[PDB]
Amino acid sequence: MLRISQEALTFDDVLLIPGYSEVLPKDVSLKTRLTRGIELNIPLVSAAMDTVTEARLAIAMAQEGGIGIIHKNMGIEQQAAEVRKVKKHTYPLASKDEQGRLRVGAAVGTGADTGERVAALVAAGVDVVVVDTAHGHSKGVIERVRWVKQTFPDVQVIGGNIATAEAAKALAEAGADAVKVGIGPGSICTTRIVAGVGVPQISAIANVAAALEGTGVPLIADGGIRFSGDLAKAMVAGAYCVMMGSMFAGTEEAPGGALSAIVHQLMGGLRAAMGYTGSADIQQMRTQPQFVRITGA
Amino acid sequence: MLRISQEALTFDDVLLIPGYSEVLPKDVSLKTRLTRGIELNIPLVSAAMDTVTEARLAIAMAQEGGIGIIHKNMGIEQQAAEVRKVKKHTYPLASKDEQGRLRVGAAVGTGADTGERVAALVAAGVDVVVVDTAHGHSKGVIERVRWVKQTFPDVQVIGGNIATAEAAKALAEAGADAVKVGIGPGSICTTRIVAGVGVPQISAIANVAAALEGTGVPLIADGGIRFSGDLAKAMVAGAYCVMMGSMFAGTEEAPGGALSAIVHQLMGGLRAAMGYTGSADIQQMRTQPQFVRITGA
Amino acid sequence: MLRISQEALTFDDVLLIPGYSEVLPKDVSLKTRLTRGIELNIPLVSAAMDTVTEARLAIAMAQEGGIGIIHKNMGIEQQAAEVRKVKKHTYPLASKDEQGRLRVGAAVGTGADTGERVAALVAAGVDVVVVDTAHGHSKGVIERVRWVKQTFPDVQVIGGNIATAEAAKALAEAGADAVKVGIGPGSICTTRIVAGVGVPQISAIANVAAALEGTGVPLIADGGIRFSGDLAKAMVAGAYCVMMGSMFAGTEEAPGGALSAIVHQLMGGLRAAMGYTGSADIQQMRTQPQFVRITGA
Amino acid sequence: MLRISQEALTFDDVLLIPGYSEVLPKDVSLKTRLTRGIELNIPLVSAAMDTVTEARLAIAMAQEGGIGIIHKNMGIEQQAAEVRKVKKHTYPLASKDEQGRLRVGAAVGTGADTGERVAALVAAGVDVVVVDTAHGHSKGVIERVRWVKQTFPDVQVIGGNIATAEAAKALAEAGADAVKVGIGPGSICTTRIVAGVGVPQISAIANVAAALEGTGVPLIADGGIRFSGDLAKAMVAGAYCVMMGSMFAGTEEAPGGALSAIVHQLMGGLRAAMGYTGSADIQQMRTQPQFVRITGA
Numbered sequence A, B, C, D: 001m002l003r004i005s006q007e008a009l010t011f012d013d014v015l016l017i018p019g020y021s022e023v024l025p026k027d028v029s030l031k032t033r034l035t036r037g038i039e040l041n042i043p044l045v046s047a048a049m050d051t052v053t054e055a056r057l058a059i060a061m062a063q064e065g066g067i068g069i070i071h072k073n074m075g076i077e078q079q080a081a082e083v084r085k086v087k088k089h090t091y092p093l094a095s096k097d098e099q100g101r102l103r104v105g106a107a108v109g110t111g112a113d114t115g116e117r118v119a120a121l122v123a124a125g126v127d128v129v130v131v132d133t134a135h136g137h138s139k140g141v142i143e144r145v146r147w148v149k150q151t152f153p154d155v156q157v158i159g160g161n162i163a164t165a166e167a168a169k170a171l172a173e174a175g176a177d178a179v180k181v182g183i184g185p186g187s188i189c190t191t192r193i194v195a196g197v198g199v200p201q202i203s204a205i206a207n208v209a210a211a212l213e214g215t216g217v218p219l220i221a222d223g224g225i226r227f228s229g230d231l232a233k234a235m236v237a238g239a240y241c242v243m244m245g246s247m248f249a250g251t252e253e254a255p256g257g258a259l260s261a262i263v264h265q266l267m268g269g270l271r272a273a274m275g276y277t278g279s280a281d282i283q284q285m286r287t288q289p290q291f292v293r294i295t296g297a
């Protein structure tokens, strides 16, 4: 009578099966979407962590073809200033808005300052507001996502974090332009030890991807990626892109080597996986390849 | 032809799935029952171990809104004296009887001294007698539970330890006001190594909770809890409250830091779990949230 | 298309479920059978290993109520002499033949000396001949078992080692008075590493016990027992008794503390298990209690 | 909605079940095929690695009754010269062509030099060309296999590496005389860590063997074998022979003890497994014995 919904799988539970391939790793397309309205040339997002993303690293992420989410452990005036630095800043893949400015995102919470914070970020020219808490399937987050969409209809909004189909549907209904997936996997996050709560990330991604199929709402896989192999698996489970934190934290660009080298490795691995599965682009990678389930052995 | 009843799960086999939430962790209700007749403001009980509960720690447990079970590795006269110390002793959550005295429990076994021991404890004003052995699904325990209920009808009686539906039904039929669950999990208890006997505690709790549904008989989860996360899982599997031993053993109040700090952490974690699952009170937490099963990976 | 017969379980895969109990550990019966014709007061046999059983330890085993199998890494004349020492040697449980002599067994192989070896052992008064090789489901062993039964009908004969129902039936048909179970589990035996061959011992025991049900042919569980808990599980899976090697190897009685202390511990644990399962005797222990299957966690 | 094809098993997931046996290990036949046209007296192939197979070790492998595949991390002229050394070189089991010359194979890739490389190797008298890449289920490999078969019909050709039924069928259709199985298991190969790609080798072998049943196309198990036990399991899963790399790398014969000692051990273990399963020859070993699946425990 124990209420078990399903067996749920993490990265180490699965491997990608090779499939017939004609397109070499160097030739596949990595283009994807962050949100309904924002495209990325690589499926990489940097985390809204105070050890990872401020203006310097967000500029670098945008130049690489991804995007950075400025963390919110700072005052409103400073966070707006971080956004302005990016917006005012050869990188052929660079993520840019219609005015040719580098794209940037910024995190907000649900606390008392949120309305004022969102307004300041929008005024600073932020491309996307990320309503970002430990539990996105909540009145607080869902209300705030709807408020941002209704109040600032010209900005993109992301809600998270979630790990279920029901949560995905709730955020989509609130007007989210993308959802962020990950409850438990944050490299350690002591969510499992302290609250006993979590959903293994491969299942979490797949369940959200299935819920959002046909909606046009992207999903971002946030947490638990240690190697480029995990990144490839996240994509095949259905993620549109992956958010990384601690792997970027030691870099020259992160707050007190080069980020470019880590990005190159990560995308090298993803390209290798696409070659193995015969996936010519991200849409194929998300929808066609298969996994095998493996044992502890 | 190997006689396997089921696959049985322990704490590390499962995680709680987040659900829609509106009530913040700080605002949920932790009120529950220890027995048919005894309510607790927090779902915490201290173990009847000689390294854990004598009068000092039992007083502290009652003040925190839980209860202590005085251990029985002492003479009858001393155990009665321990009970009197608690009964004769701002704590707004304090567990108190109808006379405004702090509640306390006391353990007895099945040996020759039991009748005299029970009589002395009852005379000392004990709120609940815990008939407490390694194997509660036994003639000795079931007979003693019935005897206490028939002889001292105004005292509460707990029987344990058990790990099966059949055992739960047997104790309920004997007149138990609550049952205590745990064969194997006692942090090590060498029951598994020496006798090869045990039932993984999440399954044990769920099986007992199902057997007792609609009876009004609470069940206490005893053993194996290392982190607040385990406590949350125990509740969702169906426990009314949790008994802890070794985690309290190092405290200022335990027999030769403060117990309050550990209680605060444990309840903090439970509150976090209730927030994640959208459980506003313990009755909801016990009956509504779901688990995912996870692999070793 | 991989040819997998079943999932097979070892000791650590299972735990015994407690059942209603009235008979205390100190009061249960440990009496069992080694073979069709030989009874034992405890379900313990010492291994035919040159670090475990020569006359000294076999005498001690018989006195304890079990039996020793003299190893065969010695000349025929010495092995007969070892047997004579036991046969010619307060121990109320002692295993004795109809003449009041301590019982003893002796191992033989399938090599050229076997006929002469068996004849010498029988002449020396051996109670049971153990035809003992790494692979008992073989022409060599099955032929030798039939030969011993036809040539020396008044001696008991054991064949092994086996791990399948088919093998059990083959030895029973050859006239074996008991079969010995264990391919792989010998504490390390590098059978799994070198040949990739083995059957997890709990499944091996259960499969053999099912094959032999109603035949009157006992089965001996040989190998892999590290703790008294494993011994209890072996019995509930269907073993009539257990053979131990390395656990006895360090003892005062084994070839270059007391064996009695280890026997006392092992039987103490088995008694505890019988108490937990409510098994009053070995026949009940073999046939009534249930297991739960558990995870790595 | 996670796209999982199957649960897939590796060596440590399974054990061989003993079966009725009459043929001793020393008496079983180890004869098998490398390709449609090439027979081997033992089922052993050395890897095309620059730490494993050049002329010296390939000569030794052929003398032992197996074959070596000369690695391709060298110029065309040197690789042809390596082949000539073997072709121009008591060993009763020696692998020889119709002219009495030791057999040898050589690896090629898919790069620009392949046509010229293949021509030079064929002119040098190579017995088999191995079109050898990380992903054999690819346009590059399948095209090259067909080209070699159509251009040099008198040479044997192997394609690999693959891990699926579909891939096996594709190579067979291209004209491959054998396929090589292994994506992931190469002792570490960081294919799993970097690309997240792989198929546990026991399942990979069985799936390919099933696809090729009745075609006359052999399959070679390449990678992941640490012990002779793994070798036996690979055969029973359906491999015709096994390719080994790192285990040979430290030997006197490998590029900067004796290879013979390692071969003797490996075949000793395989012989032991055939004895346990009652397999008199390789065809029996491949098709008749069964596995049990085992747990982490």
Ligand SMILES: O=c1[nH]cnc2c1ncn2[C@@H]1O[C@H](COP(=O)(O)O)[C@@H](O)[C@H]1O
Residues within 6 Å of the ligand: A047, A048, A049, A161, A182, A185, A186, A187, A189, A222, A223, A224, A225, A243, A244, A245, A246, A247
């Ligand atoms: O201080 C924190 N608060 C909340 N979430 C965090 C914090 N640090 C890391 N995380 C989570 O963990 C993710 C990073 O995971 P990582 O790539 O494994 O380091 C973030 O994007 C967040 O979702």
Ligand SMILES: O=c1[nH]cnc2c1ncn2[C@@H]1O[C@H](COP(=O)(O)O)[C@@H](O)[C@H]1O
Residues within 6 Å of the ligand: B047, B048, B049, B161, B182, B185, B186, B187, B189, B222, B223, B224, B225, B243, B244, B245, B246, B247
């Ligand atoms: O000395 C003992 N005898 C019997 N049970 C014990 C003893 N010590 C601990 N336990 C059990 O283990 C539980 C404590 O588990 P813990 O919270 O993991 O330390 C107790 O409530 C008892 O059920």
Ligand SMILES: O=c1[nH]cnc2c1ncn2[C@@H]1O[C@H](COP(=O)(O)O)[C@@H](O)[C@H]1O
Residues within 6 Å of the ligand: C047, C048, C049, C161, C182, C185, C186, C187, C189, C222, C223, C224, C225, C243, C244, C245, C246, C247
């Ligand atoms: O040298 C040996 N040859 C064959 N079998 C052995 C040898 N040593 C131990 N065994 C096996 O392993 C069993 C002992 O297992 P143990 O109680 O785990 O030490 C023996 O009864 C034998 O079945």
Ligand SMILES: O=c1[nH]cnc2c1ncn2[C@@H]1O[C@H](COP(=O)(O)O)[C@@H](O)[C@H]1O
Residues within 6 Å of the ligand: D047, D048, D049, D161, D182, D185, D186, D187, D189, D222, D223, D224, D225, D243, D244, D245, D246, D247
């Ligand atoms: O440098 C390499 N490139 C490609 N494959 C390799 C390399 N080294 C080892 N392998 C693979 O790993 C196999 C050897 O596996 P091993 O017997 O476990 O050492 C080779 O036959 C190859 O399939």
Ligand SMILES: [Mg+2]
Residues within 6 Å of the ligand: A050, A054, A255
């Ligand atoms: Mg900073």
Ligand SMILES: [Mg+2]
Residues within 6 Å of the ligand: A255, A256
């Ligand atoms: Mg700073």
Ligand SMILES: [Mg+2]
Residues within 6 Å of the ligand: B050, B054, B255
């Ligand atoms: Mg004391």
Ligand SMILES: [Mg+2]
Residues within 6 Å of the ligand: B255, B256
């Ligand atoms: Mg004291």
Ligand SMILES: [Mg+2]
Residues within 6 Å of the ligand: C050, C054, C255
């Ligand atoms: Mg000796």
Ligand SMILES: [Mg+2]
Residues within 6 Å of the ligand: C255, C256
């Ligand atoms: Mg000696």
Ligand SMILES: [Mg+2]
Residues within 6 Å of the ligand: D050, D054, D255
């Ligand atoms: Mg070289």
Ligand SMILES: [Mg+2]
Residues within 6 Å of the ligand: D255, D256
């Ligand atoms: Mg060299």
